[PDB]
Design a protein around this ligand. Structure first.
Ligand SMILES: Nc1nc2c(ncn2[C@@H]2O[C@H](COP(=O)(O)OP(=O)(O)OP(=O)(O)O)[C@@H](O)[C@H]2O)c(=O)[nH]1
Ligand SMILES: [Mg+2]
Lengths: 902, 172
């Protein structure tokens, strides 16, 4: 059906001006299916004929463009001629209304031009028709600017080979376009908005350039050379130059052009210095972008032939001149080039080349070192999250990488030397310390006489010193944990310096990281200072930290704890968890997440080396901890997240203790099942999979675990049985099959002989269609292991049982599995599964190949071929797969076969 | 009330809806339900100068459910391009979205958001992005899962749009 126009206008108005989101969405849908139909040709045409506003026209033009590209095959041939003339008319009338409309119409014209062979003819005719008339040149250049861009467009609907033979034409029209542009500067040319269009068009055409030099480049650079040039035109020209340079890099490409662009860019140094002199930041940035493009374009020729042709080191010189600019955003650019250079130089093992580039790198690091300085006006610590902070982090990363091309020790030394003889203000000191912190761990140990002079120097600097300096110094101290470790006498002084700083708010976050590191490095030397670490645990909330920092402190504490005498680990751990326990008990009565996590980390990183007893030292804490977690879990049972963190805590605790939680087991399982029946929090299924990972081997647990599984499966299935139950709740799928896999891993027979294996298998088969990667990975892994258990561990006692059990579970649902898999591969999922599916199919074959052959045959019989796959592609697929002696073959076959259905 | 039109754009499954629906106070959506056309979501941000309002047009990323693709982009005052750091295919298509936006919105401020930086094996590294070399363009690593730098795109855009580089977010 076709609607009335004012209804369409109502819809457009509603879409663009209804404050209510719902209304906008309704309008979007309506206009959505107003397009997509057969009638919006006429409608959009009519909307273009009428001109009530910009929006209707924009929507109309956009619809037209969209329609000639989303539905060109509904178009009767002989009529096409009338469309071109229409778009040419509309764009002739809506010229000076709004450029977006002109743009959409330009897109339409181009897209139509590309996919209709009115041989050729469009470019030369468009030009020959609209060239002389100047008032038409702006939209003419638009079209020509968008024609090469729409070749590699997403929305376009054309063969693969067609693009290659289309690209061959534009390369033909190149010269003519260049002539047009060279003619476009003759007429007009004294108008910036014209030259900008010329440069845009020129820029978007460089990927097809084969030859030609001529005046356009000279003009392009002349514009960049002149000081009078405005910011906009400067940007246009800059982008054009960059586009040329980038267009070159892939192809060799043509050195006569590269030379010209090279010298061209080289002439811009004076203009750059002018731009810097007048403090015109835009132009400086643009120039730096041009120089950076130049350098990155000719990198290989710079490194392979330093100082020859395109290897002229004046490029690096320009980049270093840019590096010398006070502004950070300027030198923020070109970091990628230096990264690439450093990379290539790391690959290379040549003394002379390293010798050659080392100087430039040193100069770079000097500049970047100067750059990390704050303002003397600055007060308080330097925030890590601020833009300048981000810059400083990027600098830290870059310099952290590059220092291998110099002496890490050397750089560190001469960096420290700066503080000794200045003596500098706090900004410089802070910057140097900041850079030193980023290099410290890379320094040679036996250079410790300097290090200890720095450490000892930055441990006893007074409190009155600027807080930023102390902050950065704390970070540095944190980064010298190895130095502290190799010189034990420094441990007690250092800690005292960090703990102090822990009590001052604005430093607390830093000290927390330093102590963490040390605790992790001087793990054995910290046994004496443990009581101090516990007090830090009791007082964690007094130091206003980020959660991560506190968690870090506790992590360190745990790592240290795990190395104390076995007879004290229990005591210490008890008094350690006591904190979180009391904190949690207090909260009733409010989010308990923090303390849950704090427990989790303690249990996570407390892995004491114990030659198994029984009993495990950490088994006297889960007792004291369980009731609290149980209560917490019972209270916030509705909050998935909190339940998740609680289950995570429990998970780490179980994996920490090991098999020594058989007493903790049944209450936990009961509460799991009890709560899960109300709130299907998938984390319960995951947790469940961990217990199986610990107790699946133990007879006497198997039954209880099976009961748990069967209990959990019912509400799960009920959850997935709902509408879009798989699309929603993919984590349920993932964790369900995680649990199932762990069952199959630790206890195959128990599951294989239960009544839930079949419905789980059915849900797997059903879940194969789900477009979700973790879930799918889990499902396919489960299928693989499940089928594999029937041909695994022959030496083992239960093999025969397992073998025939799988045989039974294959007698049914086998055909179904194969067919579903084939359908899924062909129609549902993208290729990333084909390996996983292949691993399944490969397992089915090794269980019973001759039946699999017929299963696959039947699957292929019931496969829709149309929308056409031929014989000898089905046959070759079936043969390739069934005759495979490795999963890789099955995978390749699946790829070859899958590609046919696109 | 002071408000802006923000067009949220990016390949399918990159985490646009999750992002927006994370900002709208809620859990972390694990499900992937593809957007149909556009979903408009109002996001209010309190600042030292008062509350700003971003009308976020969360557009579809999949070609099959795109709807009025460019049709949404008009009148837009800013934009977020998002991709998946664990999928170079989504990063490869950034300049296409960029060009799509530019063709409708001359040179509005735009932020590129590298989502899912919590997942291991990062295929698209931060030190590789050269998208934000220009002045009006920015880049950010973000995590819709861990709320990492989740407010930053809006703060940057807000700063650019209002014209105050010292603008701050408050609560609430
Ligand atoms: N690990 C991780 N996963 C994420 C993150 N963000 C999104 N995801 C996952 O990726 C999926 C993305 O879903 P959506 O946000 O709806 O995808 P979209 O960007 O809206 O794309 P459209 O199909 O165009 O709507 C979700 O199902 C999440 O499970 C993230 O920050 N970290
Ligand atoms: Mg979405």
């Amino acid at each position: 059906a076709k609607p009335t126009l004012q209804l369409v206008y109502q819809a457009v108005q509603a879409l663009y001006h209804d404050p209510d989101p719902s209304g906008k969405e309704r309008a979007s849908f309506w206009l959505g299916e107003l397009q997509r139909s057969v009638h919006a040709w006429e409608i959009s045409d009519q909307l273009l004929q009428i001109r009530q506003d910009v929006e209707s026209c924009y929507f109309a033009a956009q619809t037209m463009k969209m329609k000639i590209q989303t539905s060109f095959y509904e178009l009767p041939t002989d009529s096409h001629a009338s469309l071109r003339d229409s778009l040419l008319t509309h764009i002739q009338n809506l010229k000076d209304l709004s450029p977006v409309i002109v743009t959409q119409l330009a897109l339409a014209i181009a897209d139509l031009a590309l996919q209709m062979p009115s041989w050729k003819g469009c470019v030369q005719t468009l030009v020959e028709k609209y060239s002389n008339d100047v008032t038409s040149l702006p939209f003419l250049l638009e079209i020509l600017t968008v024609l090469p861009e729409e070749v590699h467009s997403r929305s376009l609907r054309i063969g693969a080979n067609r693009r290659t033979e289309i690209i061959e034409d534009l390369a033909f029209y190149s010269s003519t376009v260049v002539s047009l542009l060279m003619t476009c500067v003759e007429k007009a040319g004294t108008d910036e908005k014209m030259l900008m269009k010329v440069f845009r068009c020129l820029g978007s055409w460089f990927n097809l350039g084969v030859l030609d030099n001529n005046k356009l480049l000279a003009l392009l650079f002349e514009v960049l050379q002149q000081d009078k040039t405005s910011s906009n035109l400067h940007e246009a020209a800059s982008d054009c130059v960059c586009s040329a340079l980038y267009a070159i890099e892939n192809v060799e490409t043509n050195l006569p052009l590269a030379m010209q662009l090279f010298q061209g860019v080289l002439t811009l140094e004076t203009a750059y210095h002018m731009a810097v002199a007048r403090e015109d930041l835009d132009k400086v940035l643009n120039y730096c972008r041009i120089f950076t493009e130049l350098c990155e374009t000719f990198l290989e020729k710079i490194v392979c032939t330093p100082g020859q042709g395109l290897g002229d080191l004046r490029t690096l010189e320009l980049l270093l001149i840019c590096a010398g600019h006070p502004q950070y955003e300027v030198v923020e650019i070109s970091f990628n080039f230096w990264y690439r250079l450093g990379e290539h130089l790391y690959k290379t093992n040549d003394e002379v080349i390293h010798g050659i580039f080392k100087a430039y790198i040193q100069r770079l690091l000097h500049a970047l070192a100067r750059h990390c300085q704050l303002e003397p006006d600055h007060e308080g610590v330097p925030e890590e999250t601020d833009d300048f902070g981000e810059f400083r982090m990027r600098v830290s990363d870059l310099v952290k990488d590059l220092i291998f091309l110099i002496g890490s020790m050397e750089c560190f030394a001469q960096l420290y030397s700066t503080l000794k003889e200045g003596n500098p203000p706090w900004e410089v000191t802070e910057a140097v310390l900041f850079i030193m912190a980023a290099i410290a761990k890379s320094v040679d140990p036996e250079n410790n006489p300097t290090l200890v002079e720095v450490l000892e120097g930055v441990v006893r600097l007074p409190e009155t010193v600027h807080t930023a300096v102390r902050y950065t110094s704390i970070e540095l101290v944190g980064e010298m944990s190895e130095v502290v470790d190799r010189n034990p006498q420094f441990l007690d002084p250092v800690l005292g310096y960090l703990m102090k700083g822990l009590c001052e708010k604005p430093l607390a976050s830093a000290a927390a990281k330093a102590i963490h590191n040390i605790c992790s490095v001087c793990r054995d030397h910290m046994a004496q200072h443990f009581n101090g670490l516990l007090e830090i645990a009791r007082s964690l909330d007094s130091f206003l930290l980020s959660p991560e920092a506190a968690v870090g402190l506790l992590k360190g504490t745990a790592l240290v704890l795990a190395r104390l005498p076995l007879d004290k680990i229990t005591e210490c751990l008890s008094e350690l968890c006591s904190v979180q326990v009391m904190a949690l008990k207090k909260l009733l009565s409010s989010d308990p997440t923090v303390f849950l996590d704090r427990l989790a980390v303690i249990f996570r990183h407390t892995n004491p080396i114990v030659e198994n007893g029984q009993t495990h030292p950490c088994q006297k804490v889960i007792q004291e901890i369980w009731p609290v977690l149980s209560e917490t879990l019972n209270k916030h049972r509705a909050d998935n997240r909190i339940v998740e963190r609680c289950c995570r805590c429990l998970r780490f605790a179980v994996r920490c203790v090991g098999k020594g939680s058989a007493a903790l087991l049944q209450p936990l399982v009961t509460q799991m099942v009890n709560v899960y029946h109300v709130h299907q929090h998938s984390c319960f299924l995951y947790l469940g999979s961990i217990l199986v990972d610990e107790y699946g081997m133990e007879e006497g647990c198997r039954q209880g675990l099976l009961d748990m599984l069967q209990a959990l499966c019912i509400p799960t299935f009920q959850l997935l049985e709902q509408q879009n139950g798989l699309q929603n709740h993919p984590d349920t799928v993932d964790d369900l099959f995680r649990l199932a896999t762990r069952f199959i891993q630790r206890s195959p027979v128990t599951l294989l002989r239960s009544q839930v294996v079949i419905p789980i298998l059915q849900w797997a088969i059903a879940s194969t269609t789900l477009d979700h990667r973790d879930a799918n990975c889990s499902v396919m892994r489960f299928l693989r292991d499940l089928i594999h258990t029937g041909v695994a561990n022959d030496h083992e006692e239960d093999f025969e049982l397992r073998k025939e059990l799988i045989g039974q579970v294959m007698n049914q649902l086998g055909q179904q599995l194969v067919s579903q898999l084939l359908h899924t591969c062909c129609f549902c999922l993208p290729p990333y599964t084909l390996p996983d599916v292949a691993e399944v199919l490969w397992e089915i074959m090794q269980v019973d190949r001759p039946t699999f052959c017929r299963w696959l045959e039947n699957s292929l019989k019931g496969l829709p071929k149309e929308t056409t796959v031929t014989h000898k592609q089905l046959t070759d697929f079936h043969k390739q797969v069934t005759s495979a002696e490795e999963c890789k073959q099955v995978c390749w076959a699946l790829r070859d076969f899958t590609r046919l259905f696109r | 009330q002071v408000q802006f039109k923000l067009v949220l754009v990016g390949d399918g499954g990159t985490g646009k809806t999750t992002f927006v629906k994370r900002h709208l106070t809620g859990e972390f959506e694990k499900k992937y339900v593809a957007t149909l056309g556009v979903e408009v979501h109002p996001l209010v941000f309190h600042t030292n100068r008062g509350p700003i309002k971003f009308n976020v047009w969360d557009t579809a990323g999949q070609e099959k459910f795109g709807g009025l693709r460019d049709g949404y982009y008009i009148q837009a005052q800013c934009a977020i391009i998002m991709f998946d750091v664990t999928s170079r295919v989504t990063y490869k298509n950034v300049p296409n979205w960029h060009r799509d936006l530019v063709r409708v919105c001359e040179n509005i401020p735009i932020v590129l958001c590298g989502n899912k930086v919590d997942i291991k094996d990062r295929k698209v590294k931060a030190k590789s992005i050269v998208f934000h070399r220009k002045k009006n363009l920015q880049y950010y690593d973000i995590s819709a899962k861990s709320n990492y730098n989740f407010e930053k795109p809006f703060l940057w855009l807000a700063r650019k749009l209002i014209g105050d580089p010292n603008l701050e977010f408050v609560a609430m």
